[PDB]
Design a protein around this ligand. Structure first.
Ligand code: ANP
Ligand code: ANP
Ligand code: UOP
Ligand code: UOP
Ligand code: CL
Ligand code: CL
Ligand code: MG
Ligand code: MG
Lengths: 353, 353
């Protein structure tokens, strides 16, 4: 049976697949053609149907797992298209699955005869997956990185970051919504809180406000926008800084607060609204992460989940905001395999079955 | 000179006016007609021009202030119309002013000749005003109230609440944005944090999403809406509860998260979107207030500012959410003179000048 781990989220399904590369002569002859065809289909294509994507740049090559050498592949598709994936699965296997859809779609996976579904917790898998990928490294490079001198744009640059002793750690999982975890040891972690203002809020509001049809298009619009056209800033209320409580004139006082004026609503652009949505969501996540960090006494905050994939705007905004508002006490950290840790952690549960 | 205190906010100007009622015979003869006409205009009208409103139901009658008996009046109008107010002021006085507009519009107030402007801090005035109004009571009734048994709708009802020893206290000021204060004594308080997701976000987003033309109309739309048409709930992701971390199926997992689907965007109503906006803003304020309370070790959280005026939906939502998510550890408290404490606190600064 092929070695998959699957994280079925509210929005995206994430799949980790281990391709063995030490297949012996006897093994190659003694494998059933369906097993052969699966491996071939997955490794010879980078688009699967109309919505599956293999993130080739994330592949972990020559990894030793369960005593075999192979390549770890990372694949994603919309949860909306899971029926299609399951239908392909019934054409002519132990599936470790996590995320909410491991429960919601349990009965659907069992339409695949003789398939054994083992459900694993969405956040145990996250923790296990994150610690594992960082421990094996990203093909010899750091899995973890930050933005050095994030306060200064002429200096701000991605730099690797070492997590050899990775405790304690605040993990901020930005999916559809947000889960915040305090990780004290490999076996000791709790969900501190969460927020419902997450990746799905950005995409949903953006679609309502601008008609964008994709996450990527929403980000493209936002990169061309000016969020201060929609937001009311401290200087719009004070005429400058609010010096007494150290609030700079440029801080947002009211997100979308300038949209209470009909004349401003009529002159704001879709790009402006896309950017204000991104900035509003991103700043609220950073602020919540900051309050949790201070309360949990944790100064390393790592952001994961697919809201940040191909999203340097939000990453730089988080790097700069966390550092500025914490007066340099907290560090914003990021991971190359952003959205896949649950899928990896599920795959790692395989020996338990 | 008449006794005013003024809080010029990003959205609303709030004005407290003390009408003396012990005017003696000699005093009545020795008052200039302009002073007479001001007092008459203010006490014989409840609408001032097209946008000024006197909140008659909030009046404090037979109050002793600065050694005189009088009535304390509460008046509001949009900051957008302050030029009109200032123009009336130049037709044929010491003004204690707070809020951001005391700085932004300082030079405008000085176009009123021989007028002395004394700027006071937006949050010192809040604290002083709140403690004062509660101490003199609301014409003998409690200024402070909560919703008893807010978890149970057949039981949930407004009940008075005593603040005779009002420390410590978490004050959540929901204006355009949100300021959160930890009040340890009459003289010892700090701004813990704030959020830019406040009253202006509700009104701005609502106007963009539904075309509503007033705060009151936005609330009317929201009262008829179903926020779960726009929001993705825990049960939409899991198929029910997320039992492992105590998240009920009905909790919002992603605000507006169902709006990523074109078919749902096409079937959602304006009322649904108004309600989802209110619920999104209100829950985020409550969650932030909860994290600050836990971090500051304060279990009484009082919500003020005009986002909650004529807004029982948000109040009940805050009462229920704070109690549910804090497992009953925190109490949501409300004050009858919600938006006026800064204006009162400014008026109380009068002897200092
Ligand atoms: N191709 C894409 N399609 C949709 N959303 C995308 C895409 N790329 C990035 N995103 C963003 O990533 C978010 C989903 O991140 P992800 O970590 O996969 O969440 P999830 O696991 O599906 N949801 P959850 O059930 O809350 O854990 C979306 O809300 C978008 O903001
Ligand atoms: N008649 C109204 N007009 C406008 N907004 C109203 C009205 N009634 C209630 N509101 C709400 O009350 C909010 C303003 O509350 P308020 O406490 O007066 O803020 P502010 O002092 O003007 N702003 P700030 O500079 O941040 O302190 C608005 O954002 C609306 O959500
Ligand atoms: C006084 C009133 C006009 C007002 C109300 C609200 C604000 N606004 C704030 O008070 N904010 C505080 C913290 N902010 C962030 C942003 C990112 C991160 C991270 N990471 N942390 N905090 C948001 C803005 C100002 C004036
Ligand atoms: C697991 C994933 C699908 C997910 C992500 C986010 C959520 N959502 C939450 O985790 N929330 C936590 C606290 N909530 C509130 C609300 C009001 C108050 C007050 N007062 N406090 N907290 C918001 C929702 C669920 C699943
Ligand atoms: Cl199982
Ligand atoms: Cl002054
Ligand atoms: Mg997820
Ligand atoms: Mg105010």
């Amino acid at each position: 049976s092929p070695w998959f781990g699957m994280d079925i989220g509210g929005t995206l399904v994430k799949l980790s697949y281990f391709e063995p590369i030490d297949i012996t002569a006897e093994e190659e002859q003694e494998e059933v053609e369906s097993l052969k065809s699966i491996r071939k289909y997955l490794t010879s294509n980078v688009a699967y149907g109309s919505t599956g994507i293999r993130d080739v740049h994330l592949e972990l090559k020559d990894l030793t797992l369960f005593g075999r050498r192979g390549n770890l592949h990372f694949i994603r598709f919309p949860t909306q298209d899971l029926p299609t994936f399951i239908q392909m699965g019934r054409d002519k296997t132990v599936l470790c699955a996590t995320g909410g859809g491991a429960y919601k779609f349990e009965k659907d996976f069992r339409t695949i005869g003789n398939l054994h579904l083992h459900k694993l917790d969405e956040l145990d898998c996250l923790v296990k997956g994150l610690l594992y990928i960082d421990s094996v490294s990203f093909n010899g490079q750091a899995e973890c990185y930050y933005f050095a001198n994030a306060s200064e744009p002429e200096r701000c640059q991605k730099m690797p970051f070492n997590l050899d002793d990775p405790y304690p750690l605040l993990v901020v999982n930005i999916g559809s919504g947000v889960s915040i975890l305090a990780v004290h040891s490999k076996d000791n972690y709790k969900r501190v809180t969460g927020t419902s203002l997450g990746g799905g809020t950005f995409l949903g509001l953006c679609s309502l406000l601008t008609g964008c049809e994709s996450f990527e298009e929403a980000l493209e619009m936002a990169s061309k926008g000016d969020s201060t056209q929609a937001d009311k800033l401290v200087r719009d209320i004070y005429g400058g800084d609010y010096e007494r409580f150290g609030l700079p004139g440029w801080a947002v006082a009211s997100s979308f607060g300038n949209m209470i004026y009909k004349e401003k609503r009529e002159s704001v652009s879709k790009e402006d609204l896309a950017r204000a949505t991104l900035v509003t969501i991103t700043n609220n996540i950073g602020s919540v992460a900051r309050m949790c960090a201070v309360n949990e006494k944790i100064n390393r905050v790592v952001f994961v989940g697919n809201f940040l994939r191909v999203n340097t705007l939000s990453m730089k905004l988080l790097a700069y905001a966390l550092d500025y508002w914490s007066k340099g006490q907290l560090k914003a950290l990021f991971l190359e395999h952003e959205g896949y840790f649950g899928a990896v952690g599920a795959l790692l549960g395989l020996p338990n079955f």
